[PDB]
């Protein structure tokens, strides 16, 4: 719900300059419409997905140990907090899952390259900031 902290850690995880990755960025079709009120089940799914995304072996390969840990533990509390309040539209939750496969597909295509990873890091930042 409050992605400030996450956004900061993300901006700091950068290793390459996007200004060197001029032929890598991709529009992933973020389903922005599902966040304009925004159902919590789907906030949850967003954070949930981001968490699956960055706790892989490939992730741990790409990012700094310290930063990534702070980042992941934040997602970890966000999740727990979110999860309380989800006591109680599978259409939205689905669009979020799809979007995130478009992302891993991407990463696979690009052989998990540093430039590809920057694209993605930033892509998450965008989605985070657009989810509030």
């Amino acid at each position: 719900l409050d992605n400030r902290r996450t956004l900061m850690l993300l901006a700091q995880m950068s290793r390459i300059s996007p200004s060197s990755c001029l032929m890598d960025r991709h529009d992933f079709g973020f389903p922005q419409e599902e966040f304009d009120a925004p159902a919590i089940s789907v906030l949850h799914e967003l954070i949930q997905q981001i968490f699956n995304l960055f706790t892989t072996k490939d992730s741990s390969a790409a990012w700094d140990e310290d930063l990534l840990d702070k980042f992941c533990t934040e997602l970890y509390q966000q999740l727990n907090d979110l999860e309380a309040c989800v006591m109680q539209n599978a259409d939205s939750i689905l669009a979020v899952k799809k979007y995130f496969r478009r992302i891993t597909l991407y990463l696979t295509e690009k052989k998990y390259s540093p430039c590809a990873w920057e694209v993605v890091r930033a892509e998450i930042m965008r989605s985070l900031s657009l989810s509030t």
Partner: single-chain antibody, 228 residues
Framework: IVLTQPPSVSGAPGQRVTISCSGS????????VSWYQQLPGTAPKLLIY???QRPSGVPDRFSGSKSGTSASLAITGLQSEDEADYYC???????????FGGGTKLTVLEVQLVESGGGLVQPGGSLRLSCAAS????????MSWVRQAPGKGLEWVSA????????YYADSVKGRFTISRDNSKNTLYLQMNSLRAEDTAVYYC????????????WGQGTLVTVSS
Amino acid sequence: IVLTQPPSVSGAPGQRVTISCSGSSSNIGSNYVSWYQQLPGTAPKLLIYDNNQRPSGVPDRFSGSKSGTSASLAITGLQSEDEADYYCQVRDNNENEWVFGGGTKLTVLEVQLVESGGGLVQPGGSLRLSCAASGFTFSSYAMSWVRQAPGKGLEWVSAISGSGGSTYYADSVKGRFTISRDNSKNTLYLQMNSLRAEDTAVYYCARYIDFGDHMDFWGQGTLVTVSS
């Protein structure tokens, strides 16, 4: 190669009007779209980026949209000051090139870039363009050159990474032009060789934000004319 908009559109004040951008999916389908506005005489200014995002000072009657393989700029509460040319822009994953639409003439009822070196030359001649940059950390931004021929719309020419290790060119100028950079002196260059009469145009340098999906800032341009 191409990315089409309606050559002209008009509306009355207070009206709402729409400007279409229709592309392939090697570009629009794949990539984030930006829009640029160009008042008569002025350099283009960024108007919409990442499909629907709006820069700082831009009124909110301006909105962007993307739908599979086409973009759309929408203006509401139309006003006489919106009279300008409007350009969509996007990267094309096939050609490894940026590209502008043919533009649309809308008829209504601290950072600095300074290009130099322009001038007048014989076909087959040579010129070197400089762009003096200031008000930001230059190394950290990719740059581009973009030209507008007499009476025509925007055409992307060349681009170069923050470091300098990556360069990109439009077919038009491939191998004749060479984009350079000296980050110790905050200058972008463009060596133009074997000049042609079609190279005639105002040359803008422009600063790429991040992954080069859009450029937020433009110089005022230097005029380059090629005549026998």
